[PDB]
Paper text:
Connexin family proteins assemble into hexameric channels called hemichannels/connexons, which function as transmembrane channels or dock together to form gap junction intercellular channels (GJIChs). Human Cx31.3/GJC3, which is expressed in oligodendrocytes of the central nervous systems, does not form intercellular channels. We determined the cryo–electron microscopy structures of human connexin 31.3 (Cx31.3)/GJC3 hemichannels in the presence and absence of calcium ions and with a hearing-loss mutation R15G at 2.3-, 2.5-, and 2.6-Å resolutions, respectively. We also found that the hemichannel has a pore with a diameter of ~8 Å and selectively transports chloride ions.
While the overall structure did not change with Ca2+ ions, we found small but substantial changes in map densities in a deep tunnel at the interprotomer interface around the acidic band. In the structure with Ca2+ ions, although we could not distinguish Ca2+ densities from water densities due to large overlaps of Ca2+ and water positions, we could observe substantial changes in map densities in and around the Ca2+-binding tunnel. First, the density blobs corresponding to W1 to W4 are considerably smeared, indicating that the water-mediated interaction network is disturbed by Ca2+ ions. In the hemichannel structure with Ca2+ ions, we have not observed close coordination by more than one residue but found many putative binding sites, especially in the Ca2+-binding tunnel. This suggests that Ca2+ ions may play its inhibitory role via multiple weak interactions with functionally important acidic residues, including E47, D66, and E187. Although Ca2+ ions may not strongly bind to E47 and E187 in the tunnel, the dynamic interaction between these residues and Ca2+ ions in the tunnel could disturb the interprotomer interactions, including water-mediated ionic interaction between E47 and R184 and the salt bridge between E187 and R75. In addition, the interaction of D66 with R171 appeared to be weakened by Ca2 binding. The Cx31.3 hemichannel structure in the presence of Ca2+ ions also showed no conformational change, except for several side-chain conformations, compared with its Ca2+-free structure. This suggests that the permeant selectivity could be changed by extracellular Ca2+ ions through the positive electrostatic barrier mechanism, which is proposed on the basis of the Ca2+-bound Cx26 GJICh structure. Ca2+ binding seems to be not strong enough to drive a large conformational change of hemichannel or GJICh at least in detergent environments, and an additional factor, possibly lipids, may be required for the complete channel closing by Ca2+ binding.
Residue numbers in the entry:
A (entry chain A), B (entry chain F), C (entry chain E), D (entry chain D), E (entry chain C), F (entry chain B): 2 to 107, 127 to 221
């Protein structure tokens, strides 16, 4: 029915501010739609866009494995589903809380939902921060046009060339920014609930 | 229910004129359906449609990266999701405004929605205008049939040929026009709310 | 709810005859399903089905660009979305008209919807007629099996062969017919509303 | 609502027998699901499965165009949408008939729906019969393993070989049978309404 | 509505036992999801995975046509839609039975549904049994790694090799088992309704 | 309706703890979304990523069949549908239990649902445990970069190289972990219902 959904949305947004009510959900949906629409077009053909000037058998696969042990498309999919796990638990915890109290009325129980909201914001802050650092550690801010490889079974130094480095750099920097703003407004929502004075006392 | 949706549509369209109520939404949906249906068919195979008459390793990827640092398909996807961000915030701000005032009645509060409507039109005017200028700056109005390239690792001047320049020019000019009409009627909707006299006083 | 939809359909079909109530919508849906299901199978591989007997670099792309500056698949997609634009505006204009008059009652206002219905039929007649003429001007009624090309950078006269001309001719003639019947019954619906005597007086 | 749909189904099935109420709709859905699931797998790669033992330019496309001017996949799509056109008109004619008589009560009008039901069965009998004859005239009952071709620009007699003739013959015979049973039970439904005595008097 | 569906499910499951109420529907859905998800990955590229060591034109297509006149993917699609035909007729026969008796009350009629339930179980037993025997007759229990071919236009004995025989054998045996359990519990549901004593008297 | 679903969720979650109410469903959905989104990208092209340095006909297919008799993508699809079978039976058993007791009231019957919940957790523990052991037995924890093959029709020892071993090892270890946590919290949910004292007495 429609009177149950108006209670599910009003209870899940009673403690938050407009930063968590509107801005964060739109930022997280913006990131997902962008990855789904444009991601495969930029990084989907990474293996065929990696050309090494050699003929020894097995050398091209050894050099590509050293350059990228994990593709950005796999990294970003894992990020978006991990960050969604704390929110799925909180929405489920709110769903059953409304079902069971409907059946007795048509603070002590309303306060346990506040601790649940503070806890999933804290988990998201730690997950968003560790993902940004891992992203910088793996890929950096720029994708090169060449790559020098020295490994077995290659004999000597092998030079390999990449395709579309400018477009890949642009998409990389765009995702660092969208993720950086998600972290900032997750921290700001905690400050406005009173984290400034909690850490003091 | 159906009586809640009749209030959500009536409140979200109380301040607008027929230009913003009917014409703008149909223009923006028209642009999205056109890009989804025809876009990949015209620009999807840009890399394979770029033939350079050379044999040096790495030269074809260097010349294509100089010609297009960003494909039109990626540019237009970013435009349509950015312009949707101000409208998603306004529709969410209206959704919660209706939920909370249902629960007390079955100007001062109706006026804050007017400032929200004026503000997302202003943000869309700035986003639509900057996108048109960037589009003209990157691609122009015409797609050539040839391209001269002088860069490393290419030795000398390399001539490259493109496929389907007429069909690409037609689709480019069509999108500049659909976007140009979106900007005009976003400006006209502000004038009819009283922007002519606001800037005066 | 279900009592709102019974009013939306009854008001949007009060002035029309059975030609506009049943026959035109089925004809327009028939055209869309046919293009979606069979279109890509007949015209999707046009570029690979165009073989020119030459070896000069750049000549095959120059001759194909002269033969088809616009593919039929792109032309027909643009036709079906343009013709839908007048109907989307009329259905939206009817939606809000029902929402606002529900809220005061649970001719002068019913007559403005008649002018809106006459106006979108007139716009569709002009759009359907101009599209048929453009179709005949671009493609004709028959797709050839060969094509002579004389353009730069080709040296001399180049002969190119096409694949599946019979199946392409059949699909072309079928779409001219389905579109021709859409035009006829759009004109007949205006005559039955009284266009015969309007143009007289 | 759910009380409107119970009236839409009861009125659309008041005059029919169990042959038209259950058996015909299941037979027509069975044919559509079979074509969608298995059709592209059997006939989708017809062009690449047609090998001619020659080297003259243009000869392979001339011989394939003579063998199949229309693919079975295109023929069967056109059949299923044509046969659906009489049923879409009848269901629409019943929808508006229920909407307008709801609004006056919460034989002469019930009898006009009988003529509409008899008329769409008659149109389906003519469309189903003409399609079966056209199918036999175009393809037959068997798909060969070889094909002799004598046409320009081929010099002499050219022999071409086909792939998977057994699987194509099986799918062809299966569709003739499913369509043949659709025709039989469309004729039987007319006989049970009284066509035996109508043609007499 | 929701009170109509609670009657549609209660009437369609009044005569059955837990074997037909829960176990059979889950077994049949399990088979469909498995075929849709994994089937194309194992058998989709059968033609390209069939390598014959020859050069005569037309010999490879003649040998593959002898080995498989019907692919397992086409056989299993036909099985799952045939077995669904008796259940679609019974669910439709129950739908109209509930619609018409709602309209007179808000054994003799409840008993005709028992004969309908016994009859579709009997039809499914015959269809499931004939499909298992046909499957064993066509494919067996094992897919070989080689194949000897002696047919026109091949000159002599031709040896052909197959790819992935172990994975194909595993998927074949799995489907024989899932289908074998469907047959067993269709027979057991008839025994529990009283088939043991019916065949006696 | 919405009052029926609030009873279906309240009855299906009356006996469980928060471990089974929230955590297990989110873990199992997390695994499915990850396999659907990223799985084909990592393992989809396994056959083309397997290069053997030979020329004898039939040797490459013999060595690949020995290395992988079953792909991980097929193994993981079978795991997720098997583990879902006990939950589908329990949800169906709860659905009919609510339908039939609605129709008599608007412990002995509530206790039979407890045995059903304990039984599907036990079946899932056995299925999850046997799948983990089979996974370790088939693939291990690491995917190599090379493979030595000695089988007919290969003459001698053949060395084959694999592509992307690092990314495949990462995805393999990730799925062992997600499945290992599913097993742990299925065992913990039984302990909290009283399995510690049941096995004692
Ligand atoms: C109304 C006034 C408006 C004024 C606008 C000022 C703004 C300037 C825009 C700057 C920008 C916007 C990209 C769009 C991003 C949108 C974000 C959304 C993304 C979607 C999710 C494109 O702008 C450039 O476009 C060029 C087009 O070729 C122009 O070329 C000239 O003019 C043309 C004119 O027609 C002529 O035709 C053309 O012949 C001329 O040569 C340049 O003049 C112009 O600066 C990005 O600049 C890019 O520059 C390249 C250079 O190297 C960078 O490459 C880096 O170095 C490589 C070599 O070491 C490495 O190999 C590579 O690894 C690395 O990348 C890129 O990294 C990036 O920085
Ligand atoms: C009832 C009376 C109706 C009267 C109609 C008058 C209207 C005229 C229409 C004009 C238009 C409509 C395109 C449809 C757009 C729809 C928009 C929706 C888009 C979907 C989202 C096609 O019209 C042309 O079609 C030609 C077909 O080949 C005709 O060819 C002749 O007649 C045939 C007859 O059969 C014969 O067969 C055929 O052999 C004859 O040669 C021309 O006569 C005709 O003008 C576009 O014109 C195009 O011309 C080309 C020329 O160069 C332009 O190329 C440019 O220059 C290149 C070389 O430098 C560059 O390389 C290229 O980069 C650049 O592009 C294009 O840019 C574009 O301007
Ligand atoms: C129960 C009695 C029923 C009597 C039926 C009478 C009706 C006749 C039907 C006519 C029709 C229906 C197509 C279906 C359209 C459905 C529309 C829905 C479309 C789906 C959206 C096919 O009918 C033809 O089919 C042939 C099959 O090959 C038959 O071949 C013979 O018999 C076989 C017998 O088995 C033998 O096997 C076979 O060996 C025999 O050779 C012909 O006899 C028969 O006329 C179309 O005819 C076509 O003819 C070709 C000839 O050229 C036309 O080609 C044109 O010229 C080319 C060369 O210049 C150009 O290159 C090309 O550009 C151009 O096209 C086509 O344009 C088109 O006109
Ligand atoms: C429990 C007892 C059950 C008794 C069952 C009796 C029923 C017999 C079934 C008959 C049927 C069912 C197809 C399934 C249809 C399902 C419909 C649903 C479709 C899905 C929508 C397959 O049955 C055949 O299968 C063969 C497999 O190869 C068997 O081969 C042997 O035994 C194996 C044993 O293991 C050995 O392994 C194997 O080595 C042995 O050689 C045959 O013995 C058997 O008759 C179809 O028969 C087919 O035969 C071929 C012959 O030519 C026909 O080819 C035609 O001629 C060509 C050459 O001129 C042309 O080129 C071609 O154009 C044309 O086609 C086909 O047209 C078709 O008639
Ligand atoms: C915790 C204790 C748990 C104990 C577990 C005991 C259970 C044993 C499992 C048995 C099974 C499970 C398949 C999963 C089925 C899941 C069903 C769901 C399907 C999804 C819908 C795989 O198990 C095998 O896997 C091998 C992996 O290569 C192992 O190889 C060794 O150990 C590795 C260790 O690491 C080393 O690495 C590796 O180097 C070692 O060589 C074997 O030891 C092991 O038996 C299937 O066995 C298979 O064997 C092959 C042999 O031929 C059969 O091939 C047949 O003959 C061919 C040649 O004539 C034909 O050409 C072919 O046509 C035909 O097929 C197959 O038919 C099938 O029978
Ligand atoms: C803010 C501080 C944060 C500190 C972070 C510390 C954490 C360290 C992370 C470790 C990790 C995270 C992978 C992400 C997993 C996410 C899980 C979700 C999955 C999605 C579902 C990547 O981390 C490595 O990335 C390298 C990038 O190349 C770096 O390279 C250097 O630095 C660069 C710097 O720029 C330079 O550019 C670059 O030139 C430098 O060379 C390394 O320094 C770094 O350790 C995985 O490590 C991997 O190492 C390889 C080595 O062999 C392992 O290969 C194994 O051996 C092969 C040869 O025998 C076998 O062939 C192969 O079979 C086997 O695999 C892998 O197995 C795996 O263990
Ligand atoms: Ca680029
Ligand atoms: Ca063109
Ligand atoms: Ca043809
Ligand atoms: Ca075959
Ligand atoms: Ca295998
Ligand atoms: Ca890797």
């Amino acid at each position: 029915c429609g009177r149950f959904l108006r209670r599910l949305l009003a209870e899940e947004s009673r403690r938050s501010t407009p930063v968590g009510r509107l801005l964060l959900p739109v930022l997280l949906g913006f990131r997902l739609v962008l990855l789904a629409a444009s991601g495969p077009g930029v990084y989907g053909d990474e293996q065929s866009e990696f050309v090494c000037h050699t003929q020894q058998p097995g050398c091209k696969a050894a050099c590509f494995d050293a350059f990228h042990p994990l593709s950005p498309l796999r990294f970003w999919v894992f990020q978006v589903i991990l960050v969604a796990v704390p929110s799925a638990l909180y929405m489920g915890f709110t769903l059953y809380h409304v079902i069971w109290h409907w059946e007795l009325s048509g603070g002590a129980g309303s306060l346990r939902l506040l601790w649940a909201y503070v806890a999933q914001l804290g988990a998201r802050l730690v997950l968003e921060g560790a993902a940004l650092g891992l992203q910088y550690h793996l890929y950096g801010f720029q994708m090169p046009s060449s790559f020098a490889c020295r490994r077995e079974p290659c004999l000597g130094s092998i030079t390999c060339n990449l395709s579309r480095p400018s477009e890949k750099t642009i998409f990389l920097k765009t995702m660092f920014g969208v993720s950086g703003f998600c972290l900032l407004f997750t921290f700001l929502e905690l400050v406005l609930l009173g984290l400034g004075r909690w850490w003091r006392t």
